[PDB]
Amino acid sequence: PHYILNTRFRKPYNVESYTPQTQGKYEFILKEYESYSDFERNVTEKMAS
Amino acid sequence: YRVLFYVDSEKLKQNDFNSVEEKKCKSSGWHFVVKFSSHGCKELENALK
Q1: Chain A positions in Cβ-Cβ contact with residue B13 (cut-off 8 Å)
Q2: How many helices and strands in chain B, by DSSP H and E?
Q3: Which cysteines link up through disulfide bonds (chain B)?
Q4: Among the four A42, A43, B6, B22, which has the fewest Cβ within 10 Å?
């Protein structure tokens, strides 16, 4: 007899053991980045004679 | 059931404003033996953002 999730299974002659394992790990890496830059140059010159 | 959260929020804002304004006006007048007239005007404006 072999039981997996309330279901009766068969172990063949070549397989030693087939056991469901939980083994769960997930990683989630999010990146956010912004850069701003501004430049302004007003120049005015007047001459009268 | 382990969890591992990390949040590193960073916000930087820099603003620079500079304004320069210069104006000069000169006038000279002389009337006697001979009429003489002189006028001078100078204007300068500079702005940086």
Answers
A1: 36
A2: 0, 2
A3: 25-41
A4: B6
Touching A: B residues 9-38, CB under 8 Å: 13, 15, 19
The number of residues in chain A equals: 49
| Angstrom distance (rounded) from CA A15 to CA B19 | 83
| Cβ within 8 Å, pair A49-B40 | yes
What kind of experiment solved this structure? Answer: cryo-EM
CA atoms of A24 and B32, how far apart (whole Å): 106
Whether residue A29 lies within 8 A of chain B, CB to CB, comes out as no
Comparing CA positions, the residue from B9, B10, B43 lying closest to residue B26 is B43
C-alpha of A41 from chain center:
44
In contact, A4 and A10? CB cutoff 8 Å: no
To what resolution in angstroms was this structure determined?
A: 5.6
